[PDB]
Symmetry: D2
Subunit: 509 residues, 4 copies
């Protein structure tokens, strides 16, 4: 009954996976908690089992990790970068089998599964050069015979909690950056993607062991809300990087703040695209489609609100409807599929709930809006017109392929409509007007962390810092100087002169 026991899935063994796998690594493999079975979202068939972490499993892991840091922190950063470089190569060796696993356990199409592995590979090679660059400036002191310097040091243990939609890349961003910065990591992934977590951990573990380093440098404790809450309340966790829903992310933020710890929050998005009258419709229409239905609309940066100028509204919508009909559905591991299933059945139930509510709030389903009659968690990509921009269902984030479409007249009101929501991740405008673009990038423009022009809301790369504002959390990952979130700044004044302070009337010696 298990998929891994079938001959057509023998490639899973290339990742070191078995019928039942250990979900805890801290130098040694284990797991005394509940055994979980993960399923294929494309056909609802069981893949394999993973033994999750118990409470005691977690305690020993944190302790060994903090013990491993004593060794890891003494290693020069460029030498820490060389370790990450080897991690990048090891991922290259398994890029096809691991990407296939992502498509199998998570549900995204094959080219995106492999692409997600490639993101980890790229940020590794990026982290290598960065490992020779991290540091602060030498500042000129106002005091004669004194030096003023800014030092950066690791915070220690970096706890990493990731979500289902990107079960490889998000960890990879945090991991590669935290490692070169001299920290040790503890990983708790989404329970429904444990096999991927185990597979990635297995690749890194070997690299650490071959270099005679303690494996606890990149620890793993598979588990649910119990393990996650524990990490947020644990003073031994110096930084908790959390990626997930806003409702959970809010509670994560409060618990860490209660113990004066550090948090890095990457939460929900309600991303909008704006098309003006002077926009290239040949560019606009497909950009809208791919950003709205991409990964079955389960990206953090998925387009969920589409604002179109009155002059071109009906045309764009109709041209979108004809295009939606040409979207090829099917199993995610097939070389012609563009659209796979949703990750859970609950997501299907939430998809329907938002649809029923959208019609109740006065919206009209112009395409899709129904579950597909087929095995797996398949729903139709959906377009909804007629809603007010301030509709409740429209300001609510649903992790499903539902695109709310609105009309607007002037630039001023449509910039405000983009900013009126609680989320603040990504945003895009399509136009050619030079002045409008610079306004969009200015203080009266978009309030999001990602502000794009003539490219959809998923436009982002390794070179820049990734994250959002407001209810998205304010956290940043990967590029720019985001590494500073994984280190602590100290401002240091050094007296090297033999000069003594003014006596101020006091007789010493």
């Amino acid at each position: 009954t298990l998929l891994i026991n079938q001959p057509q899935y023998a490639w899973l063994k290339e990742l070191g996976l078995r019928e039942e796998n250990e979900g805890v690594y801290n130098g040694s493999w284990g797991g005394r908690g509940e055994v979980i079975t993960t399923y294929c979202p494309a056909n609802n068939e069981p893949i394999a089992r993973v033994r999750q972490a118990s409470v005691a499993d977690y305690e020993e892991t944190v302790k060994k990790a903090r013990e491993a840091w004593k060794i890891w922190a003494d290693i020069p950063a460029p030498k820490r970068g060389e370790i990450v470089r080897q991690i990048g190569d090891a991922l290259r060796e398994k890029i096809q089998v691991l990407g296939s696993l992502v498509s199998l356990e998570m549900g995204k199409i094959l080219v995106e599964g492999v692409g997600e592995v490639q993101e980890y590979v790229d940020i590794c090679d990026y982290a290598v050069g960065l490992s020779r660059m991290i540091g602060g400036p030498i500042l000129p002191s106002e005091r004669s015979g004194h030096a003023l310097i800014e030092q950066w040091n690791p915070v220690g243990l970096v706890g990493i909690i990731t979500a289902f939609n990107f079960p490889v890349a998000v960890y990879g961003w945090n991991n590669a950056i935290a490692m070169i910065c001299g920290n040790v990591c503890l990983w708790k992934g989404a329970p429904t993607t444990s096999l991927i977590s185990v597979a990635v951990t297995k690749i890194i573990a070997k690299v650490l062991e071959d270099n005679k380093l303690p494996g606890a440098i990149c620890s793993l404790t598979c588990g649910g809300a119990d393990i996650g809450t524990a990490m947020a309340k644990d003073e031994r966790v110096n930084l908790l990087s959390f990626t997930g829903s806003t409702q959970v992310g809010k509670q994560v933020g409060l618990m860490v703040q209660e113990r004066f710890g550090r948090s890095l929050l990457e939460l929900g998005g309600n991303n909008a695209i704006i098309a003006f009258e002077d926009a290239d419709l040949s560019l606009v229409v497909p950009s809208a489609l791919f950003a709205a239905v991409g990964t079955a609309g389960q990206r953090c940066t998925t387009a969920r609100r589409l604002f179109i100028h009155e002059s071109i509204h009906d045309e764009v919508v109709n041209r979108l409807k004809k295009a939606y009909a040409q979207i090829r559905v099917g199993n995610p591991w097939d070389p012609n599929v563009l659209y796979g299933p949703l990750h859970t059945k609950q997501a299907v139930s939430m998809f329907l709930g938002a649809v029923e509510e959208a019609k109740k709030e006065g919206g009209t389903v112009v395409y899709g809006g129904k579950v597909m009659d087929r095995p797996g968690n398949y729903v139709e990509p959906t377009i909804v017109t007629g809603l007010g921009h301030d509709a409740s269902i429209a300001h609510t984030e649903t992790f499903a392929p539902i695109l709310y479409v609105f009309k607007f007249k002037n630039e001023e009101e449509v910039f405000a409509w983009n900013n009126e929501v609680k989320q603040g991740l990504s945003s895009s405008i399509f136009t050619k007007d030079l002045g409008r673009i610079f306004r969009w990038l200015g203080p009266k423009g978009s309030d999001c962390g990602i502000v794009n022009v003539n490219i959809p809301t998923s436009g982002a790369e390794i070179g820049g810092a990734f994250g959002g504002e407001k209810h998205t959390g304010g956290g940043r990952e990967s590029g720019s100087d985001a590494w500073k979130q994984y280190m602590r700044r100290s401002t240091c004044t050094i007296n090297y002169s033999k000069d003594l302070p003014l006596a101020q009337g006091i007789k010493f010696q």
Copy 2:
């Protein structure tokens, strides 16, 4: 009865202060809240009165601030820098009279009063150049025909809450930086330093008005915990910079996180000095004294813990005793004075409580430990030996001149003792060992935000970021790239080619 009504204090009128003053500014002056009277800690006599902000006063002020931002944000940063330059000049014009007010209402000596105003002047002149520099890099995209840029924009309204011990400089740091970054400010200082807040606002108000700008750019709402709490819960406050107690700062952080706002926290410190066997004792003894009794031990960065190696412990303790006996107390606005009074009568009572508790936990008072019999809130600078490093009173932050002295043996254990407290503001070592210094600055060294060598825990300047770790809050002010806390980062991809997607 009011000091301001007395001829010997007529200099107060040079700052525009009257018998009763308005504690609210948002373009107009007002205050429908409680009338508060502030006292001089040197003689316990009332100085003047201030009408605080009502609930309606606060609500109206926020609205005018967010309206003022619409104009302020459209102004180019270097031109915002020009205003900041003018603010610096207006402070120069009142530096001596304003500094005297600091000594009168707060209690610190004159040279520190004038000195605190100078810090505001210096951060202004710094911010001028900084206004032509703030921004992000142009990065090379992996995509052909695309541009990748990092943009920085103002966060909007910056709420600023300050404490009594530094009632001018802390606001100045936040104000000067936030202004050039295109934000508007709303200030709530300590109730017992309301006159200082009013006087400072008066100087800035003049600058804004002469330049035909809305006064709400730098608003003032005098009040207590109710105003502070309202700001912490107000969604219209995009960034709240709080300086104060660890206990109160903790709740502020929770309230701000609850509504997904931004906070900048500058809380308590339990700063330590470490003297090794190879240290220059001619340098150590005065460094400790000035860092321990400075401002009657009411600085955030005041030295409260002194670790000395066994070989030189008794000698250093003795040499501190002889130097402590020469410390001149008296009126803070008086020359040759090095040591002023405590801020409140309550602080004197807490000083005694810390003294009695130190004796109960097994400590020995080798100097001081008593109240001085004189008008005002004067106490003796105190030295305590014999406590264990893990003593309860030693991990407790008391805003009074009490120096706890400890012995240590090895480098490893004394570094840990420096880091074992909940606070993480400032720290210092005195030594000549090259390796020891770099370990101190390294990952197995100090966990504080300010890590000094051969200079006491009050060693810091404008050019660098000021702040601490752990229970100190993690926030930073003034130098380096601390300005990023007052702005929002955006990562921007611009497609300019004619290529269509696959």
Copy 3:
């Protein structure tokens, strides 16, 4: 002398007399040849200045290097405080100094005052900069080691400036080099000696008020002999030269000969390009002001105008009508937009270029003649019909002569902008999103200044200022230009107790 007349009594407020000392190194002097400067508006003598002899130069150089011994030990933020006070001293005299600029050089009053403001702004900028300069602490690959990047002053910075900007260029170099901990030696244009003296007088007071040796900002007024000496002098650690390309070439060669540092800000042949989709309401006035500004004597003055064929004739006509409205007159008089050329010699160079353009096949559509009036006034001139590769068009002439060209496609007009030897400033007027990024990219303009919808004189203090190719490559004012005034050292510090591998050898 104009200074002996009551209507110019304001000149005495700058401390200027009938005859002035042209050497300052803590003490004032000058044993060289006496030079007399004239007002280009009426060819009347203003005052005299005694220039530096050879011995004057030697004593000045020696005293400057002694002053550096003190100056370098002063903390950078405290050096910034000195620069800040220099800024305030300039504010107090901004109106009279700007008036002197108009009198002695010839540019209009609003630009004269503005140039003083340029010195003032860069001062206030350098103040914050004095708390920021430095390098990174880098992570060493070696355990127990530190890797740091240090910056230190180069020592003595010689500064050579030109006539057209006798205040701002020196000011740029002064404020930056000072906060970097260097001492300066200034040789200005001989025809703007009074301005050099007036500026030196203001700063000297500031240094004296702060009890600093005056040689930190030294002055040695002189001609080619002083310039030649500075270029060959090993005691001159960095030489900043602003002037003609032909002389700048020889200056660079002399400095390279002795392995010194040079900062060259030389000539430009700057072009504006207007495409069909450009806002003609923006193009026409922008073009005029950039072409006729300061009588076309700026380094960044527009000398080449490329217009798209479809709108060429219209733009030319609208420029002809606009040129007719240019108000000429005395530079120290309000509503005046156009003053005289700096020298009478320049007028002869103006006429020579006009006749040579017509000989090469050009057509004068406006101006091209001398004005019958006192001073060095010439008509602002427009020339059409020349080929883009015309000899007169590739030559930098310091006169108000605008060469107009037609083009068809983007590719060729980008190349025509880059085909000249000069590479200072450049501008395009367009709205096409793609064309702008190509203009800013590797296949676009090769200049140091690359503008969009703004004329060739578009620049500000926050950014680095300078050009490429035959312009010299030097940068001034903004960005990380300060690195040109300091020396980089890469420093590895061993603080561990570890000994190197013996590799089989027995020590101790």
Copy 4:
């Protein structure tokens, strides 16, 4: 007779080397110039032959390179970095055979041969991350509705001339950085290491070709002074990176300055180590030896001057004499060997010439000073005492293992003795005094580009910029913001508002 025709050297074929090899690559292999034979300095036996570039070979290559740039410059910088990354892997795959070629043809011991290849591998991996980082800041404009940004673009063609002592790493530094910065390269290595030049190019040739890129991006033209001079005079070479002797570098610098081009100069050094009384002699003695005799004392960063405090001089020298006697000499491709031959027989004649000149000037040889009786170019590592610090031979850079030893009394004078030479590459002090250390790194300390503490003069790594001052040339390579030397800066102002310029009285 050829070593490559002998079976014991068959590993050379793993690098694609044959009996006679092509010394020109620009997409195709060729070479119509003079045929050169390279020899092994360990036994003076011929290895293989190389056909050098003729003039016609040079012209065609430059043309193809500049045409190849049109494609290379349009490729995104991170995509150029991906190319540099593969180049690193190709070097990794051949590190042992290539390192052996370095030891065979140049003469350094095997662990250093491999080490030099490893440095090229490391700068590739560094440059990968750097390719996503290069660029300038977006500055806040003072002008409303305007944007201010600093752009960086490639300079075009990067000519690279290298020397014998580091025939792999020096090119590698320049190649990797210039490539990600969007430039194309033209390489002319030392004639005596032509095989190394060919072998490296072949490794790169495969990488470019496998990615369907024009091979001229990393071109090769093997040749001597005739090829080198042309590169210095060719206006089509936008940046010339030259590593070599001070005497030649000066002439290269002048020729490049003559045509207003860019130069990057990495020239000679006369590097000094200083030992103070409080220094750890257990650290000093091995540091001095390894820094003085390493690579047979033929590094640019070789310790050539040793300053020791009066109190500890005789002890340090005596301890050095005993350690020098333990230096194991022999063939470079054998383990436990620390000292190989000099690169040429001419270097042997100049090694001896310096020894004889030291005795004539009053020096005493306390160790070595004679030729070794064996095949190849082997000489004894030499120590010289008793010389004045201003001895002519001490100020002369000799590429041989000769250490001149001096005594000093006070800190001030020995700092001055460090700075008195024309060269300005590397320098080191050994001490524990905190104040002395900060003075040494400060404005009154060393004037060199590399300033180390308690680590010898060869202490440097990739993360930081590498280069020297004064007569060393001023150029920088590898780390920090050294990449700026391979690109041109532009300061760009963009008006995006609808605002029109002030009319100033004119009606449009």
